[PDB]
Structures are given as C-alpha cells and as structure tokens.
Design a protein around this ligand. Structure first.
Ligand SMILES: CC(=O)N[C@@H]1[C@@H](O)[C@H](O[C@@H]2O[C@H](CO[C@]3(C(=O)O)C[C@H](O)[C@@H](NC(C)=O)[C@H]([C@H](O)[C@H](O)CO)O3)[C@H](O)[C@H](O)[C@H]2O)[C@@H](CO)O[C@H]1O
Ligand SMILES: CC(=O)N[C@@H]1[C@@H](O)[C@H](O[C@@H]2O[C@H](CO[C@]3(C(=O)O)C[C@H](O)[C@@H](NC(C)=O)[C@H]([C@H](O)[C@H](O)CO)O3)[C@H](O)[C@H](O)[C@H]2O)[C@@H](CO)O[C@H]1O
Lengths: 290, 30, 247, 290, 247, 30, 30, 30
C-alpha cells in the first residue's frame, strides 16, 4: 500500500514468542521479499527512529549535475588542418552514456522522464603565454537528425528558430533547461528492439530517447595564436520520474551504443567473478585479530 | 524561485515522499 | 535601482545546486504522463528487495556457482558451513546486491538487514542449520557454541525452503560509515555464520550435495546518507563509439 | 536554573551587615564555585547594567571563518615533476587542527555539532610577467576514505554523485555549506579511544569526526608558462551546539594527529611554567611608580 | 528584469559575514540531536567557573608548585604574604584561568571578579589573613595598614577552608580594554594583596608551612567585547602530520 | 535570508541567550 | 517582470490561445 | 523604483499631461 515515508520506521518493543501456528520463515519462490520484522525475529526494544530518507529520493539521487560531454578543440586558424578536426566548433549528439557514473545511475531504471538542466563550462589554454581571451561561444540546440553547421561561420548559426545560447568564458557557466522532450511519456533507458521498420537498424538505440544536439562554436574570429578550448557539458536531470529498477551494471562498459560486456580480467567485476575472491566460504575477509 | 514562464524550468522537486515498496517486495496476489 | 552586493559563491557552479534555469524551448508542451508500472520515488524501495548474495566468492566457483553455497552431509557435529562478512559498504558477498550497490552510492547507513536463505536440495533432503549473527567486537566465531551466543535462527529445511535471519541494527552510532577501513568501530557490522545444527541427511537417490541460495535485503528502518560516486563502476578511457557522438 | 540572559546582571544596593548565622566564605571542596555576591561582600550601589552578552555567545564565538587549509602548488606541465608534487591538483582531508587559532577555539569543547561553511580563496602568481589567467578550479567534496582522483584529468572529476564546485579566480571566493555530517549527534573534538576493533588503531582520531575531503584541481589545461596557485580554505562553523568545556591548550601544539605537548623552552607556556615568571609572589609585575 | 547596481563591498569575503550559502549535499538529514550533558550556549558560563590562579609564577616553583602559595609562621606582625596583578587581559597569575583565557579572546571587559582562596594546611593549623583589593591609582600597597584602606575580607582559616574576595567592578569606564599597556587608566584594575592578619599558628606535628590555592572566576555582571585572536596560542610552522592531510 | 531548500544552509543562529551556568558553577546536589 | 515605464518593453505575450481557423478553412457564406 | 533617501534621486516623471496652450495661443483678455 502506497504511503508517505519521510523517516525510517520505528521499532516496537517485543517479548518472548512460543506459538504453535503462524510464523522468520517465508516463501522465496513466490518472488516476494521476506516480510519478517525484527520484532518477530529477536526480542526488541522501542526505538523512535528519526532518520530521514530524503537523500535516497530518486529526485535527489539523480539530480546531480554530471559530466556528459568533454570536448577539447583547437581555437586557431584552420586553413590547413585535417578534415577530422573540430575547426573552431564541434557538434555533440547529447547522450547520457559516455561517462559511466551518470550512465550507471540512469541505467538503474528502465524508464526515466526528466527535464535536462544543461550546464556548459568552458576552459581555455594557450598553445609562450600572452593571456587568456574572454571568448564568446555559441551553443546551439539542434534536434536529433536535424541540420547542424558544417563550418564555424556557417549560416546555420543564425538561429532563426534553433535555440542558441551565447556565453563568455569569464562569465558563469552557461545554463539551460532542456525539457522532457520524448515523443513517449518516458525515455527508454533500455530499448529492447529496433527503431526502424527494416531489419538493419541499430539494436538498443531509440532516437526518441536522444535529447538532441549541442553544436558549440567559438563566435570569435581566430586569434593570431592558437588556443585549446575545452568545453565540458553537465547535465542535471530534474523533475524526475523513474520506473522499473534494474540490476546495476557490474561489468565495465565497453561502448556507448550498447550494453556489451567483457568484464575485468580478474575479480572483482570479471565475467565469471563479480565479487573479489576469498579463500573459502568459511574464510572471513577482514577478521578481527585478537 | 522561478521567474520563467515554463514549468519545466523550475528547480528540482525533492518533495515526493510517497513510497510503495510492496510493488517490488510483495508483488504477489494472495 | 536595487543596491546589491555579490556574496562569496557568486558565479560558482556547484553540481548539487537547486535553481530554476532558462527554458531552451519556450511553450514546449511535454508528452502527457502515462501510467507506467513500477515507479520508484525513493531508492530505499529498491534496497528492500532481496537479492542474491555471492557467498561463494571463491576461486573455482565460476560465474553462477558463486551464487549458491553447496552443503554436504558431514560426519562431525556442530560444523561450520560458511560465513558472510557484513559491511555492505565494502566488497564481499553483499556488494553486488540491491542493498549493496545502492548503499555504495552512499557513505552512511543505518537500519536492519534481513538475510533469507533458500534451501535448494531435494524434497527428501532434511536437516537443521543455525544461522548466527554475531555483533562486532572480536574475531568471527568458528565453533557453533560460540556463535549461537549471538543472534541466531535455527532452521529445519525439511518442509521449509526458506528462513530469514534478521541482522538487527545494533550500533553505537546512529549510522555506520564507510571510510575504507573494514575494522573500524564505525564500520564493522559483525558476522553471519552458518553451522550444521543437525546434519544434511539425504536418501540414496537424492543428490548428496545440496545448495543454499542466500538473499539480503534491507528492512524499512534502513537509511542512507552522504551521497558519493560509486566505486563499482569506473573508466580510464572514453567508451567505444563515444567519439561518434561528435561526428 | 536555566534562564535567558541578554545583559549582564544588575547590582542591587546593599547596607551594613552584622549577623550571627548565615554567611564570603564558601566550600571549594564541593567543586562548586563561590556564590558570594558583591552585595554580600561590600556595600554596593544600584547599577542598572545594560552590557550585552551576545558577543560571547558560542555561535558568535565560533562562527568566525577561519583558515583551515592553505595549499600552494605549481600550475604548469607536470610531465617531468616528482611523484610527491601536486600535479595541478591537490586533495585535502578536512581537519580543524592544522591552524592553531581555530584549533584551540574548537578544543575549548568536548563535543561540537556544527554545519561547516566552506569558503575557498584562490590566488595565483606567475612563476617575466604576462598577466594572471582567470582559471577555473574544481573543488570536489569526497567522503572520508572514498576515492579521490589521482591525476588532473582523472575520470573521478566527472562528479556523477560527488558534489563539485567550479569557480574562477576572478569570481568571489567559492562558498559551500557542508552540513553537520557526523554519524553521532556531535563531533568528538577529543576522542579518548581507538576507532577500530584491533589494538593497532590511531589514538585520539575518530574518523566519524572527519568532515571529508576537498579535492581541488585546476580545470584548465596547463599554460605554456608555470603558475603558483595558492588555495586557501576557510571554515565557518555555524548552527553550533557546544558541550562540556575544557581547559584551553596552554602548551604549543606539536602535531595535528594528537594532543602531544612539549611546551616552550622558557616561561610563558613552558612544560613546568605556563605563566611568565616574576621575581617573588610579593613582586608586582607592573607596579605604578610614583 | 530587475535594475540593480553593485555596492562597495560586493564580492568581498568578510570572515565575519553572516549569510546563507549553498548546501553541498541536498536532502542530507543530519543525525538526530541527542541530549549531551554540559551544553554551553554562551562563553560567560565558562568564565564564571573558578579556576586556579598561578600566583606562584616564580622561578624554582616548578609546574604544580606554581598553583599554590606556601605560607609560613612569621615572627613579625602585619606581614605581606603575596600580591596578585589584576589585569585579566595580560600575562600573570590570572592568564591561565577560565576567566583569563576566554577574556584574552576579547579586548574589552567589564564586571566583578571573585577570588576564592582555599587554605590547605592541617586541621590544627589556625590563623587569620586579610585579603585586600586596592582600586588603581598609585603603587601596590606593601604594608597592611595601607592595603586595608581598600576593599578587604578578613579570613580566619581555623574551621574555614575558603573565603571569597569579591573584586568589585570599580572603573570609570563601562569597560576596561587591553591595549598592551598595563599602566593605562583604561586597563589597570588595581591590586590584590594578602597579609598576615594574625599569624599562621600550627602545632609541632602539623607541617609548619601551609599552602593556599587561589581561584578566580567572573561574576554574572561580567561582559566581554571586541573579539580578537588569542595571544596564548600561535604557530610559526605547520604542525606535524599536517602535510599528511594532503596525502 | 535563505533561498536554499536545506535548513543547514541558513546563516548562523546568533539568537540563543539561554544560559545555565549553574551546571558548571553549582554542580552540587544540596 | 517589467520595471520599465513603457508597456512595449515587457516580455513576450505567449498567452493568446484564441483561434479562428474557419476564417481560412471555411471562408464561405452558406 | 527608488531606494535612495532623496526625492530628486528618482527616475524621470513622465506623467504630467496637464496642458494650458491657451496661455500661448490665446493670451488675450476679451
Ligand atoms: C584500499 C584499501 O584499503 N585496500 C585495498 C584492498 O581493498 C585491495 O584488495 C582488493 O579490493 C577490491 C575492492 O573491491 C572493489 C571496491 O573498491 O569496492 C569492488 C569495486 O566494484 C571495484 N570497482 C570497479 C570499477 O571495478 C573496485 C576496483 O576494482 C578497485 O578499486 C581497483 O583497485 O574494487 C577487491 O575486493 C579485490 O578483489 C581485492 O583484492 C588491495 C589489492 O589486493 O589493495 C588495497 O589497497
Ligand atoms: C609587548 C609589550 O608591551 N611588552 C613585552 C613584554 O610583555 C615582554 O615580557 C614578556 O611578556 C610575555 C607575555 O606573555 C604572553 C602574552 O603576550 O600574553 C603569554 C602568551 O600566552 C604567550 N603566547 C604564546 C603563544 O606562547 C605570549 C608569547 O610568548 C609572546 O607574545 C612572545 O613574544 O606571551 C611573558 O609574560 C614573558 O614572560 C615576559 O617576559 C618583553 C620581553 O621580556 O617584551 C616586551 O616587548
């Protein structure tokens, strides 16, 4: 029965039981957890328990601002740079899967509905030193699959209808709230299927669950010297509803595209040994020596 | 405090203390 | 206008701050909330679900063999079968449990634990075990007459596939803390041991070795404080295809 | 009897006493302080005493922001530096014992319950001069014993669940309130025992009373020149409850790990002479010459 | 938005400011307050507890010998035994007292002091002392007939192990201040002297030299203003193991 | 003034003028 | 919120949900 | 809005719509 819980439950005092009838012995096979109370197992005292439960609220457990993107690029003249390089601008398809602390926390659930509070920290380093330029950056939110700019002075940066944020390095970090955007009532943290009508689509990736694109340029023309500009994107989920909890990820993540697994070479978190080994089942690992 | 016109813009809602752990601990019928 | 002054902490980005921020999409109407089964509002709901202990965290126990304890017929009395270390903040048989993994996002914890053991021999397999919780202080008890002086349940698994050993919250402090020190008086919960109370006694056509699956959950007096990064996941590189998000 | 005291007490006028019965002579041996009033000792006047007592409130006496940590490190390229050096980042186990003004004030009590308001001042000096970079720093709060980062670009700085504050040198100082965190209802300022079940643990140190860790990096990649970056951490206790007052520390502190004592070589505050010497007990040290 | 302007003092960190600041741990529930004995809400509670004066702050008085004044039988009358300097803000017999150490966190002070002397001879030891407080102005009185013109108590320590000399607050100003000038009219409290009122008269099997332990407390008319760093502790280095907090 | 959701975040509480010095000056029973 | 004296200075007015699509979809008379 | 103690410190007073143009257009007596 659903109830409001702000503190952990009190313990009632209990006495000696010696009864022939009603049971510390439950039924595992029903899939139910043991409802055996400590009052029924040992002889207890009354404890008025004032321990709050608010820090394990799913809103508090997930509304931590976590690093989701970290991109360095050269801020310089890119007349003669490679066609792979971020030429004063990068684009980033927003995902929660590239950094494993946020990834494992969000993958504790099957479905998540949250607004995405996006914080953008920019740091700059000179590639001799003459000082750091207070550069203006543009972060433009582009939807999944939509047109992203192809150069720094692209006419896609005009943002007639795309939301752009302009921000300076000397400023506080740029901060935007992206709404809950999904075409569904929740994001699918795990998607058991293909999101395409042919059989060649990607498994596990529903583009409904992709927030969108951060297209981040430097608005400034290049300086006579080069700079390395590191953009860090932080996401805080908020107004979070979470559904269907899952086993946590035990093995190391291999990719962001899937739930592929290798494990570590030895215990802990190996394919065939998640917990580190002890010598025997009757060996106590941190036995007090007296 | 929220001076934005969208309700999703607001701060986090750390106020929902409703629990129903019995849907995971007792998902049985009898 | 308004005379103001900036405080210390102006312009900082605390990752745990709680403020309204600018809507990137004005007048966006989110998709209507649909009822989805299994909503979690508080992580203590997950932590109260019993999940398999890896008591057989030994070498040669490979994969799924680690989630059961094989008990055999013995020819000496009062014999120790297995023991379980009890610090849920540490690595051990409790770590990859629902109570263990959520607790290791936290530093401080209070509250009783329940241990449920399911006997998985045959119907014809009979026997009695004693499951002892020893509050901390000294070494782990190795004989039965030493361990039954603590909290124990005696379990006939004749018709009864399961019992619960409540590990009651017996601590000096309101919380126990992780500090990477297993032997600390602020950390150590004590011990769970299992002994042959009688003997595993099977007939000739039952399998002579039987298995126990152990579970652990938290009770509803359980609490977790001081949220920290989990030591259970980590990276020293970028993952595969993470660069493809920039392309 | 407990009472609200906002001003010092008034003096009532008194007259000549010549009484055979009730007593200026008390009982020291009971451990009680003399309750002899000035009305009973001399012949007094009425004084309406309007002197406030608010500055000796324990909240005011202890909610001063005091220097608790002061760490300089080189902000430079650390490819070829020693393995002892802070390589663009330091960690600090939060203590109140490294700086003796705050230490002696907090060690005036046996038990303290306070929230810790943490203020972080960062100063930078060039190691020729080209200007000072407005650097971004990360201060990440890590619990006692938990994992702290091992390099500057560690993936532990992503802060999926650790609280981090990002702050710039040009900004006002970073300021966070750390709550009262102890597993007990108060911190033990003094801990007469071992906080471990074996006999090899540290005496006097209860890790329950350790606030946590400040892991402070520079978020910026290194510049072509080197900088010395001094981080000063300030702690203001607040919402303070104090229990069981103690004798103040008289001898100089030797260590932060214990209450070990040496004294100074001569009076004052020597092992065998806390107060500076005078010639005799009938020698007045600052006698008015007329 | 709101038209604002920054005042002088914007962005400053005053170490005595009083502001709310950002919670590093949201929804942290602190450990429940338990009643602990001996709560102090105001430092004047400590300052009213009598504590030992180090009146014997001389050389050859080693350690604990400094906390008692040995009185002997004398063969001249009206003789001076000891004197006490009275500025609680300075170094002297009052400094390492509970009233002295807390006051030296402050600059300004008002209010009466009490001096309690415990006679620690034998039961058979008899005698009368006169404990004189002299308000400031001139030199410390050296003869008994000069000192008894001020505030005094005459104490027979025959059956009476203790008396109290109230040093009443007699000052021109509301407060007395420390300025590192002992002879200042804003600082100097005057003198406490002790004289043989009769003689320490012991029998042959009592110890012929007897000790006095002197105490000082503040009364409840006592006040302290202007909080400063204490001159009683200091450092010119980092302490031992302080570097280990960075490792 | 406090716009944070945690009560420990607030400014210092310099308002508790309750004293009981008799628990240190008269801890006697008669 | 608007502290300017001109009403055109205010933020955008995203509150007009009146529709009359029939002036474009049914501009007929019978 | 004015948080200064002097009334001359305030913003401009663009609210006086009283006109008497007849003192310039009809300064005649009959
Ligand atoms: C730090 C200390 O006081 N003692 C160290 C010993 O604990 C260590 O022995 C190994 O400890 C391992 C601990 O298990 C975890 C953990 O920290 O909880 C389990 C985590 O899931 C795992 N995390 C990931 C992402 O895989 C974590 C990780 O492997 C380690 O932090 C990597 O160093 O380990 C485990 O039980 C091992 O089986 C056990 O041998 C010894 C090394 O023998 O070093 C001590 O410093
Ligand atoms: C400054 C002045 O006007 N006169 C100086 C004399 O006072 C000084 O004579 C010495 O004074 C010493 C003062 O005692 C304290 C103090 O300042 O109150 C006692 C403190 O507890 C002590 N602090 C610590 C951390 O140990 C402090 C400290 O030792 C001094 O500040 C260090 O200089 O001293 C004390 O009574 C001495 O016994 C007395 O000789 C003379 C030197 O003879 O110098 C004058 O400038």
């Amino acid at each position: 029965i659903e109830s409001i819980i702000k503190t952990a439950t009190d313990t009632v005092k209990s006495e000696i039981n010696a009864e022939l009838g009603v049971v510390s012995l439950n039924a595992v096979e029903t899939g139910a957890t043991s409802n055996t109370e400590p009052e029924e197992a040992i002889q207890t005292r009354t404890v008025i328990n004032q321990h709050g439960v608010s820090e394990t609220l799913v809103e508090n457990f997930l509304s931590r601002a976590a690093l989701v993107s970290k991109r360095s690029f050269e801020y310089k003249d890119h007349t003669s740079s490679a066609a792979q390089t971020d030429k004063n601008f990068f684009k980033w398809t927003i995902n929660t899967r590239s950094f494993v602390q946020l990834r494992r926390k969000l993958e504790l659930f099957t479905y998540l509905r949250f607004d995405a509070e996006i914080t953008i920290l920019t740091t700059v380093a000179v590639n001799t030193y003459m000082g750091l330029p207070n550069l203006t950056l543009q972060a433009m939110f582009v939807p999944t699959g939509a047109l992203t700019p192809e150069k720094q002075d692209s006419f896609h940066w005009q943002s007639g209808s795309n939301a752009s944020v302009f921000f300076k390095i000397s400023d506080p970090p740029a901060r935007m709230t992206i709404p809950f955007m999904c075409i569904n009532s929740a994001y699918s943290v795990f998607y058991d299927g293909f999101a395409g009508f042919e059989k060649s689509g990607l498994y596990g990736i529903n583009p409904a669950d992709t927030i969108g694109n951060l297209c981040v340029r430097i608005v400034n023309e290049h300086q006579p010297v080069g700079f390395t500009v590191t953009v860090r994107v932080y996401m805080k989920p908020k107004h979070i509803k979470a559904w269907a909890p899952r086993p946590p990820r035990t093995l190391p993540y291999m990719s962001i595209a899937n739930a592929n697994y290798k494990g570590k070479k030895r215990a802990p978190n190996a394919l065939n040994a998640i917990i580190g080994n002890r010598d025997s089942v009757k060996t106590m690992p941190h036995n007090i020596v007296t | 405090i929220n001076f934005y016109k969208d309700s999703y813009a607001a701060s986090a809602s750390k106020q929902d203390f409703s629990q129903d752990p019995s849907k995971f601990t007792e998902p049985v019928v009898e | 206008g308004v005379p103001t002054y900036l405080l210390p902490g102006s312009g900082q980005f605390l990752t745990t701050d709680d403020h309204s921020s600018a809507p990137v999409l004005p007048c966006f109407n989110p998709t209507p909330e649909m009822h989805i089964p299994g909503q979690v509002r508080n992580m203590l709901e997950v932590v109260q679900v019993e999940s398999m202990m890896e008591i057989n965290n030994t070498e040669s126990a490979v994969g799924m063999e680690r989630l059961k304890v094989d008990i055999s017929a013995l020819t000496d009395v009062d014999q120790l079968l297995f023991n379980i270390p009890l610090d849920i903040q540490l690595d051990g048989p409790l770590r990859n449990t629902l109570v263990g993994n959520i607790s290791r996002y936290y530093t401080h914890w209070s509250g009783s634990l329940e241990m449920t053991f399911m006997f998985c021999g045959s119907f014809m397999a009979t026997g009695k075990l004693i499951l002892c919780y020893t509050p901390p202080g000294g070494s782990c008890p190795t004989t039965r007459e030493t361990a039954m002086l603590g909290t124990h349940i005696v379990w006939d698994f004749g018709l009864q596939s399961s019992v619960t050993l409540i590990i009651p919250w017996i601590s000096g402090s309101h919380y126990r803390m992780f500090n990477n020190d297993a032997k600390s008086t602020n950390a150590n919960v004590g011990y769970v041991t299992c002994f042959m109370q009688t003997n595993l006694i099977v007939p000739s056509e039952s399998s002579d070795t039987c298995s126990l699956i152990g579970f652990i959950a938290a009770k509803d007096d359980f609490s977790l404080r001081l949220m920290r990064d989990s030591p259970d996941i980590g990276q020293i590189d970028h993952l595969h295809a993470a660069e493809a998000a920039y392309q």
